């Protein structure tokens, strides 16, 4: 039916939103790379202290 098709479109939009949730996780993956860089930055600071010694 037309109403059911509109509901399917809303489900498709939710499916797109579900795909966007992975994109949101992909958007959050950019912060993960920054978090990984921060982890390396902490090691770099520790390495710099070791290098200074």
């Amino acid at each position: 039916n037309g109403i059911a098709t509109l509901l399917q479109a809303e489900k498709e939009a939710h499916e797109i939103v579900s795909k966007a949730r992975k994109y949101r996780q992909d958007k959050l993956k950019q912060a993960k790379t920054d978090a990984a860089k921060e982890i390396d930055s902490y090691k770099i600071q520790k390495d710099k202290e070791l290098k200074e010694f």
Binding site: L6, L7, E10, K11, H14, V17
Partner: peptide, 20 residues
């Protein structure tokens, strides 16, 4: 039936957002 399916779509989006 459209409203019930639309409501389930919001729950699916909320669950997907929680997974993100």
């Amino acid at each position: 039936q459209a409203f019930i399916r639309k409501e389930a779509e919001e729950k699916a989006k909320e669950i997907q957002l929680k997974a993100d």
